[PDB]
């Protein structure tokens, strides 16, 4: 399927032992509203804890949303490695249920936190 | 005189009174002669006060650094009309004798704050 790509960057900060999670950008999404566009958001959060997550902002009318958010989970440096980060797209609906785009999900454990990149995913269905 | 150029997002955040400035990236930064890349950060302010400083992380070895990155000036909204965001991209130096790229302006009077942009301008010469 070609449901679009996402750019995001992963860091630890070993002096307050949080993840940061980078949503940057996301590129060439479908359009699932009349007229050639979406209205795009990410959820982000750490499985298997669905309890804190995060979203960015609704970009309106576009398929190339240019997010510049951060996210910050307060997690053990020692328990990071069972975890799986989940980014997943939607399109913003008011008048219904939003719209699943697609997904990317992350296992911690692959993850070299030595030096931060800036990392292109296509999405994928759940 | 080909110095690349930076993307960037301005908005007020008319709830806590605050100038909000995203860094994004830069891209197509001249290559030097012998070294082939560059160490990029973005220092950004708001003239005239010189003061209230920020910048972003040392980029290493890129001429097309991904900041993702977010700034926030406490700023009075009826005081912004005459001010102007200076952002400023300098090739790091370990000893503090950092060499400018290049940069450029945005005078506060030329922005419309009632929708948010993300915005690509060539860097200037200084
Ligand atoms: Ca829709
Ligand atoms: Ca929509
Ligand atoms: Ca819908």
Known sequence: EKLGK???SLDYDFQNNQLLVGIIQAAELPALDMGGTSDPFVKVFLLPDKKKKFETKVHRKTLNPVFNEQFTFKVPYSELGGKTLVMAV????????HDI???????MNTVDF??????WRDLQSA
Chains 1, 2 share one sequence.
Request: aromatic share 20%; net charge negative.
């Open 6 to 8: 996402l750019q995001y």
């Open 90 to 97: 939607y399109d913003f609906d008011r008048f219904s249920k």
């Open 101 to 107: 785009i697609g997904e990317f999900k992350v296992p």
């Open 114 to 119: 030595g030096h931060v990149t800036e990392e």
